[PDB]
Amino acid sequence: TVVVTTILES
Amino acid sequence: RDADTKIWNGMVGELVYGKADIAIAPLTITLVREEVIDFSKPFMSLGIS
Amino acid sequence: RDADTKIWNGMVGELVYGKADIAIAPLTITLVREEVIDFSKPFMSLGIS
Numbered sequence: 001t002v003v004v005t006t007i008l009e010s
Numbered sequence: 011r012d013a014d015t016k017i018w019n020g021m022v023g024e025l026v027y028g029k030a031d032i033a034i035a036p037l038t039i040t041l042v043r044e045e046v047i048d049f050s051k052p053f054m055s056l057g058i059s
Numbered sequence: 060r061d062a063d064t065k066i067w068n069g070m071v072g073e074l075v076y077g078k079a080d081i082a083i084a085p086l087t088i089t090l091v092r093e094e095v096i097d098f099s100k101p102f103m104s105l106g107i108s
């Protein structure tokens with residue numbers, strides 16, 4: 001797969 | 011960027027170093043980032059408030 | 060592109076055909092002209108009013 005990084009923010 | 015090191019501590023430091031592939035996040039397109047990563051065209055408009 | 064002929068005209072078309080070099084103009088970034096030529100990051104944002 002690919003790596004889809006995020007930050008935890010509403 | 012770190013002082014004397016330039017190694018990014020955060021999402022883009024995971025994105026630059028081969029760890030992460032795509033970064034879909036509220037990531038501000040500033041000149042420091044775009045000179046060493048790519049951005050697509052923006053998807054949301056905002057400002058300092 | 061031309062209506063009924065699909066031949067590229069205009070300021071986009073001049074950049075297509077090699078004659079024009081850069082188009083620093085009130086020109087909207089569009090998917091169909093993204094296909095032929097490159098765009099920068101947008102410098103002004105606006106909506107249909």
Ligand SMILES: NS(=O)(=O)c1cc2c(cc1Cl)N[C@H]([C@H]1C[C@H]3C=C[C@@H]1C3)NS2(=O)=O
Pocket residue numbers: 039040052055100101102103104105
């Ligand atoms: N108010 S405006 O439309 O003239 C306008 C429009 C824009 C501004 C600044 C202003 Cl003042 N800066 C942004 C910048 C922030 C990051 C995203 C695009 C560039 C890099 N471009 S924009 O979104 O095209």
